Amino acid sequence: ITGTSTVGVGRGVLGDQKNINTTYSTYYYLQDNTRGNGIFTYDAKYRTTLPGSLWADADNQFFASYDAPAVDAHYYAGVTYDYYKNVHNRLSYDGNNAAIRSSVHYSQGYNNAFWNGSQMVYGDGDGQTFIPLSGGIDVVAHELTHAVTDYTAGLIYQNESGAINEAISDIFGTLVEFYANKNPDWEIGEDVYTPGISGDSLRSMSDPAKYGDPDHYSKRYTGTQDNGGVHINSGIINKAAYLISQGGTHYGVSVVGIGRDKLGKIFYRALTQYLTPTSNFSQLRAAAVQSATDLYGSTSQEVASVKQAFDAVGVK
Ligand SMILES: N[C@@H](CCCC[NH3+])C(=O)O
Ligand SMILES: [Ca+2]
Ligand SMILES: [Ca+2]
Ligand SMILES: [Ca+2]
Ligand SMILES: [Ca+2]
Ligand SMILES: [Zn+2]
Numbered sequence: 001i002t003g004t005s006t007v008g009v010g011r012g013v014l015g016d017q018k019n020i021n022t023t024y025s026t027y028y029y030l031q032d033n034t035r036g037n038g039i040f041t042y043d044a045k046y047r048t049t050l051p052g053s054l055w056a057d058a059d060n061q062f063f064a065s066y067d068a069p070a071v072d073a074h075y076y077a078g079v080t081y082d083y084y085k086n087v088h089n090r091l092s093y094d095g096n097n098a099a100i101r102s103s104v105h106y107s108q109g110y111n112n113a114f115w116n117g118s119q120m121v122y123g124d125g126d127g128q129t130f131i132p133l134s135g136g137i138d139v140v141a142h143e144l145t146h147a148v149t150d151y152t153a154g155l156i157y158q159n160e161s162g163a164i165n166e167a168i169s170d171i172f173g174t175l176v177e178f179y180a181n182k183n184p185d186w187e188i189g190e191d192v193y194t195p196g197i198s199g200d201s202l203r204s205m206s207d208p209a210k211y212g213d214p215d216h217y218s219k220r221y222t223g224t225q226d227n228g229g230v231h232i233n234s235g236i237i238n239k240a241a242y243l244i245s246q247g248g249t250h251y252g253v254s255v256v257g258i259g260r261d262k263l264g265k266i267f268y269r270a271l272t273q274y275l276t277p278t279s280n281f282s283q284l285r286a287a288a289v290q291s292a293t294d295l296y297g298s299t300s301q302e303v304a305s306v307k308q309a310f311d312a313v314g315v316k
Contacts, residue, residue, distance in 0.1 A: 003014030010062025013135030026096030036097030093147035153275035162230035166239035208235025
């Protein structure tokens, strides 16, 4: 909508207060004009029609329980925008400041979130498996990262290319969580998963096997569930990324860590310069090796660490 830029205040899913960028024209709308062509947050009103209505509020205060998922979808889309812009010099998901659109209150009891090709979509959860999923910065950034992958490598959402697509979203979702730096970790979705259970998460990058996901290529899933295991086999790449950043010894193979910033630079360059829609895990290794070579030199520690990490997870 056309209007004047304003700053509202609200509470997110976990009860934390934050300022949000709004637009005033009769109502205050969840429209942030300060980032590219805008960040726009919508109310799906417990239905499945998308996007629903641009979120309108009478007073620019967003403290109602119903408001919380909207607050966080909006705010964490902004943080994600800022990460890509400030860290990778990327302007929105398409690199040309495309508008970022999110809908909250999708369906009833919906225990998921997704990128639908055009926008982000968040369920409220059923209150047992999940609380509203926009409460997780890693979740928000994971979903927005699918848009980045759509516009870049375009990894096909099936089998190995699909597992890479998922891993890229877990890697950058995690790096955005570290960027914001509020109790960051190498786990996915802990802030919105199972409110009744402390200390769990949907997936772990540091130990994928804690939630039954493979941590070595020899344990890969080759069945048909989950588009050929895209959320399962992602653990193999997630583990490699974790090892590249943090180091460790895994099935007897030692990896010298090079840290998160370098992990992000290597994988951002791989994603945007070398991966293609059909890339498999072996091709990801080559892309990461070439990217690290470009950035740091062929005999560098960074290249050595990329190679050791993929060796450690069985990807040649
Ligand atoms: N995002 C994952 C996990 C959701 C958990 C199941 N409700 C998937 O779509 O497979
Ligand atoms: Ca209000
Ligand atoms: Ca965390
Ligand atoms: Ca996390
Ligand atoms: Ca939990
Ligand atoms: Zn995903």
